[PDB]
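Follow-up to my post from last week.
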Amino acid sequence: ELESIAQFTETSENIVDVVRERHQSKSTLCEKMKELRQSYEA
Amino acid sequence: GVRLDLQYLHGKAKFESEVLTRLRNMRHKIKREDLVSIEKIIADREREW
Amino acid sequence: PDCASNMDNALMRMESLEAEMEEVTEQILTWREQQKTAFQMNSDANSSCITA
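User reply:
Got it. Predicted complex:
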């Protein structure tokens, strides 16, 4: 139980860091996908 | 006595496995249907030119 | 509760990065085949003018 509550906190904060790096690490994915999009919208 | 919800955990684990599968299906379709259509039509234009 | 709340808030932004990829794939493929209808119809149109 206490191993799994520890794992739940660690995993929940790891996922909240990994998705942050996918948004903020570089241009970023969230930037270059909108640059690409706006080419075909144009 | 705090409870971890095993049905939410398994529900998101399933749905992320379905995201990971949708991404693989899109990415493999691009690499069998779309790019093979494109690279053929390109090379058949260039070899008639 | 805040661990769960922030983790679902992360996964919904990963789900949102799938959704932007498949729509931009369909934008690229929609435009690819749009252009070919315009290029085709110009060949039929100019072929008709020879008749005059």
